[PDB]
Amino acid sequence: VPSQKTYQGSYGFRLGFLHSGTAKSVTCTYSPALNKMFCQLAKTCPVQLWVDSTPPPGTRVRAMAIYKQSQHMTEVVRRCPHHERCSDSDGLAPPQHLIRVEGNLRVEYLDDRNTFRHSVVVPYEPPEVGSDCTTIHYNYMCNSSCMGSMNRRPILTIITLEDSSGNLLGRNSFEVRVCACPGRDRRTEEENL
């Protein structure tokens, strides 16, 4: 099982999220209290990389999903057969991969040879000039309620900062729910606090 231990590392690596709120029109919204992202299928999911100092050239940013619950954690998170077989290809992403990056022609996808786990990696870019963070647009290509894969089992996304040689520079994570009404579902999951 890949580590999910938070690790700010040498560069002070942390995640940020847009403050999108829970209006019914929201397609992507993050709950600080639950550290949980609520997303519509295949919609832009902005994840902000915040660093205290700029990591070197060739730094890369990896995303990987694992099941949150210990009893499922060894199971590879992958798209259900239906979504696997859907005609929603962007021509870069493997059809089985739950997490894609959109709007980045330098995206790289990995099926780990030994663990079989899926990940998607992009070059780290410094914040645009005048910005304080780097935003990656992720897409989640299968629903939490999909019976053929996650089937209501919660998943985590682990975001890793690695150098060009693959050494770990930093790590963070957040829970993800892929659903029809993220605004409503966030608001609802938060009313039980």
Tokens of 12: 């002070």
In the bound state with ligand [As], the residue whose beta carbon lies nearer, of 111 and 137, is 137
Residue of 15, 26, 39, 146 interacting with ligand [As] (CB under 6 A): 39
Q: Which does 15 bind (CB under 5 to 8 A by kind): ligand [As], Zn ion, none?
A: none
Cβ neighbours of residue 111 under 8 Å, at least 6 residues apart?
Answer: 94, 96, 117, 118
Q: Give 82 or 106: the residue with its C-beta nearer to Zn ion.
A: 82
Residue 42 contact among ligand [As], Zn ion, none, beta carbon within 5 to 8 Å by kind: none
What is the dihedral angle through the alpha carbons of 78, 79, 81, 82, rounded to the nearest 10 degrees?
170
d(CA 174, CA 156): 6
Q: Minimum distance from CB of 21 to ligand [As] (Å)? A: 13
According to DSSP, the β-strands at 45-50 and 108-111 are: unpaired
What would the x/- binding string for Zn ion be over residues 69 to 88, using CB under 5 A?
Answer: -----------x--x-----
Please report whether residue 146 would count as binding ligand [As] according to CB under 6 A. Answer: no
Strand partners, 108: 121
Q: What residues from 44 to 103 belong to the interface with ligand [As] (CB under 6 A)?
A: 45
Phi, psi for residue 123 in degrees, rounded to 5: -65, 135
CB of 167 to ligand [As], least distance (A): 29
Phi-psi category of residue 67: left, alpha or beta, with phi > 0 → left and psi -120 to 50 → alpha: beta
Q: How far apart are CA 49 and CA 61, in angstroms?
A: 9
Binding to ligand [As] by residue 37, rule CB under 6 A? yes
15 interacts with ligand [As] by CB under 6 A: no
Distance CA 8, CA 100 (A): 24
Binding residues: 80, 83, 142, 146
Give the Cα separation of 170 and 51 in Å (integer): 10
* Closer residue to Zn ion in complex, CB, 37/122: 37
Say which entry of ligand [As], Zn ion, none residue 146 contacts (CB below 5 to 8 A, set by partner kind): Zn ion
Binding site for ligand [As] (CB under 6 A): 28, 37, 39, 45
Binding site for Zn ion (CB under 5 A): 80, 83, 142, 146
